[PDB]
């Protein structure tokens, strides 16, 4: 007759590759605490334009 | 007659990082980050 079946090893090989890069993209996010001020209230000029 | 084709292999290989695999064995690699120091200023 007519049948259909999937190959586990070829599908697993592709998933192992994508899960590897999915780990590579979300791994160890930077941890920043006391930084600089980015939103300002009034004009300051030289230092503010550089910040 | 038979004619097999293949590549070379080392008994001990370095592990490197790739896009898909984090630890994959290769025949040879080099270090790009200088971490050692002589301790003296030339």
């Amino acid at each position, epitope marked *: 007759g007519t049948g259909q079946a999937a190959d*586990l*090893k070829s*599908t*697993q090989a592709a*998933i*192992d590759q*994508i*899960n*590897g890069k*999915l*780990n590579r993209v*979300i*791994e*160890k996010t930077n941890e920043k605490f006391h930084q600089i001020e980015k939103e300002f209230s009034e004009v300051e000029g030289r230092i503010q334009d550089l910040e | 007659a038979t004619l097999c084709l293949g590549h070379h292999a080392v008994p001990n290989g370095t*592990l490197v990082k790739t896009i898909t695999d*984090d*630890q994959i064995e290769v025949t040879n690699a080099t270090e790009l980050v200088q971490s050692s120091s002589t301790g003296k200023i030339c």
Partner: antibody
Framework: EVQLLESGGGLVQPGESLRVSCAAS????????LSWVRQAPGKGLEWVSAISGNGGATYYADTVKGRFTISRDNSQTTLYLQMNSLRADDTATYYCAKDESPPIYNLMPGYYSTYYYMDVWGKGTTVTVSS | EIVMTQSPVTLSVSPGETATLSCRAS??????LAWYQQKPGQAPRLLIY???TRATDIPARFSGSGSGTEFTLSISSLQSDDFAVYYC?????????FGQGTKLEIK
């Protein structure tokens, strides 16, 4: 309730075979991975192997790379581990452990996500290999 | 194929004080790291997974941190029933490995 029960084990002569069962009962639909972890009294934990979906694992530790083989019977919901060519150092309390992965991984529900952490541990079966 | 070394082998901490543990790991590891509390005569129990994300319905006194190589586990308010042994696992090398184990004492 996600508890599993380990059956089997016992005393065996070195060189013999022995398979340990793990009745996966509860929340586990058994489209998730399972693992075996052994520990000898007086030693720490050591991951043994893992199973995924159908025949996606094929994941064995270097200590048992050529001896242990992992079976899965989803129809009866039981995980197996055929321990052949047992040596003296194989004496340990073999734990059957659940396996969970971050939801970002495990794209297809059945196949293996190469990053698992064990959450629900079993009661454990003690296997002694001596004379 | 990726060894885990915990430090020290055993530590003595008075009840109430914070007990910081170590889980130094050769080669980088960040995504997956799980801590366990195996009380004597019992199976291990999951505490933290990933690095800092603690397991479900476990006390908030169990804190986790670390990145790549150096990992720590601090128990804020210590109780007399915390005399268990603690372990840490890792990803991946398609082969997860466990730690040696850290014994915790009271008083």
């Amino acid at each position: 309730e996600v508890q599993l029960l380990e059956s089997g084990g016992g005393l065996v002569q070195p060189g013999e075979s022995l398979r340990v069962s793990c009745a996966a009962s509860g929340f586990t639909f058994r489209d998730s991975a399972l693992s075996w972890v052994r520990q000898a009294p007086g030693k720490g934990l050591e991951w043994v192997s893992a199973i995924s979906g159908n025949g996606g694992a094929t994941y064995y530790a270097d200590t048992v790379k050529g001896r242990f083989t992992i079976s899965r019977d989803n129809s009866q919901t039981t995980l197996y581990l055929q321990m052949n060519s047992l040596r003296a150092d194989d004496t340990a309390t073999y734990y059957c452990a659940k396996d969970e992965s971050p939801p970002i991984y495990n794209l297809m529900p059945g196949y293996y996500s190469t990053y698992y952490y064990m959450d629900v541990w079993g009661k454990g079966t003690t296997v002694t290999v001596s004379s | 194929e990726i060894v885990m070394t915990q430090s020290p082998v055993t530590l003595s901490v008075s009840p109430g004080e914070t007990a910081t543990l170590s889980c130094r790991a050769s080669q980088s590891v960040r995504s997956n790291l799980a801590w366990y509390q195996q009380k004597p005569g019992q199976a291990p129990r999951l505490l933290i997974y990933g690095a800092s994300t603690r397991a479900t319905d476990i006390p908030a006194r169990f804190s986790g941190s670390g990145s790549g190589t150096e990992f720590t586990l601090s128990i804020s308010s210590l109780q007399s029933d915390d005399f268990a042994v603690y372990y840490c696992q890792q990803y991946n090398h398609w082969l997860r490995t466990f730690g040696q184990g850290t014994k915790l004492e009271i008083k």
